[PDB]
Symmetry: D2
Subunit: 111 residues, 4 copies
């Protein structure tokens, strides 16, 4: 139905060096309609943490070394310079919205 491929599945980075993770989806475009991608990191001892929302926006209190970019069904999370505290498992997540369809309406009147 819809497949998401995250590349790479493993990263060995040195502190100070950039890092980049890509996420690509196979949603048969039509009309979902709008795909949106978020990025999380899970580290031991914390709940999963939101890093990037809808491709581009950073959550509050996330270091500014984190950014995202992309288009269509291909999105990327970038770390400008990795720090040692960044070890973790990073996940991309696809949200598939659809705008609402409405009925024509029914006027209800009384006597």
């Amino acid at each position: 139905d819809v497949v998401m491929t995250q590349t790479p599945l493993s990263l060995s980075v040195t502190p100070g060096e950039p890092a980049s993770i890509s996420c690509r989806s196979t949603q048969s475009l039509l009309d979902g309609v709008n795909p949106s991608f978020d990025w999380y990191v899970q580290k031991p001892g914390q709940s999963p943490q939101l890093l990037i929302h809808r491709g581009f926006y950073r959550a509050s209190g996330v270091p500014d070394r984190f950014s995202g970019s992309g288009s269509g069904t291909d999105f990327t999370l970038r770390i400008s310079r990795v720090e040692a505290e960044d070890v973790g498992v990073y996940y991309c997540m696809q949200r598939i919205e659809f705008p609402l369809t409405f009925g024509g309406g029914t006027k209800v009147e009384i006597k």
Copy 2:
């Protein structure tokens, strides 16, 4: 696309009498579960939520309003229509989709 048919187009009711409004959707219809909301716009007011997800009444909606249905066919019933009920009623279909996740990316530092 998806087309919604709401039936009837207008209701002239006598106070105290029930009313019934039906909504049908034309929703690949498997990786899809639709949900139906009912709003009413009353004269001089903006639209307000009435019934959420087919069956649940909004805060402050009288128990005279109920919903029923399944799949792509849902109905709003007003048990006894009162004067404060006058308005234009709309059904709305929301199409959720559960979220898909990629595999992990283990970031380790060597």
Copy 3:
């Protein structure tokens, strides 16, 4: 609750002339990012999406329609109003919230 004010209530335009419709929201307003959609209902048709998330046009919407704004204040502009544009236009605010996760539950078999 949240109240939406749409300005003006009605537009009588001369063909070829621009039009402008404004929407303001009264949205704890920090763990909240609102998004604004614009729909139009034309005579004889059900409502149809026009502008999604403040700025993006729906499929088949002429480039004569554009949006602008920020926060809780957004505006729809029609550059040259044409006869096929007649209708009732509505703004709608969607309130997303990013998803919260619990910690893991490691299930192991001893």
Copy 4:
């Protein structure tokens, strides 16, 4: 702002024996408005897998030993009899919807 506590953080179960995981949220009720809880399992070599949607509904192809129940901000995932293939990390996820608020409308007419 809103806290989610999943209990327990670790489970040692024997095959054939039931298991139960609970998730509790501290969303200041008002008006979000409607919280909804989903359950996933992550195992090595697969992407995370949806098990239970909106508290109660099982995804297609998920064994029927999985069910959910609950109310308010307290929800539970139940495995009637655990099988050895069920080892994994189980996550609850809270979705906070809000119904749409609409403007009053603007009649656009021409000459």
